[PDB]
């Protein structure tokens, strides 16, 4: 339900140009309710999210590219 409420808030922000201030709505874990995280002082560097996305996508691509494994027995 919390993720559903957050998704509803962000969807309303994206579809309604008059409610663009809802982009900052995040999760308040203390009370379990959506909360404006920009005014709550919950920030992250943009580089963190950008690099996380890029690195995770590349790792997923690398692993997904495999379809066969050959495991040679140790010589000993």
């Amino acid at each position: 339900d919390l993720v559903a409420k957050l998704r509803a808030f962000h969807n309303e922000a994206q579809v309604n140009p008059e409610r663009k201030n809802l982009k900052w709505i995040g999760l308040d874990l203390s009370n379990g309710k959506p909360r404006d995280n920009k005014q709550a002082g919950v920030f992250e560097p943009t580089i963190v999210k950008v690099k996380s996305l890029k690195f995770a996508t590349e790792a997923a691509i690398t692993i997904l590219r495999i379809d066969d494994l050959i495991k040679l027995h140790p010589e000993s």
Binding site: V42, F43, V48, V50, K51, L53, I61, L64
Partner: protein, 77 residues
């Protein structure tokens, strides 16, 4: 995770979790006879568009806030 630690220093758990979820969903698609190349292309396009959307809509300039922004970022850390 080690690379994320070296190059950024934060979000080391988040990147691992996101990568594992991406791989799981990609394999779920592959099991439905979706070719892995199509999944890879979709993932690349989605990552590029997500980066562009973040840079264009979801960023806050720190000069608008000041030392309070640094304090809040540290406290979040």
């Amino acid at each position: 995770a080690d690379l994320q630690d070296k190059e950024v220093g934060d979000g080391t758990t988040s990147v691992v979790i996101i990568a594992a979820e991406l791989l799981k969903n990609a394999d779920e698609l592959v099991k439905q006879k979706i070719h892995p190349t199509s999944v890879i292309s979709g993932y690349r396009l989605a990552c590029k568009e997500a980066v562009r959307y973040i840079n264009e809509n979801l960023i806050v300039n720190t000069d608008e806030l000041g030392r309070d922004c640094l304090i809040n970022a540290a406290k979040t850390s």
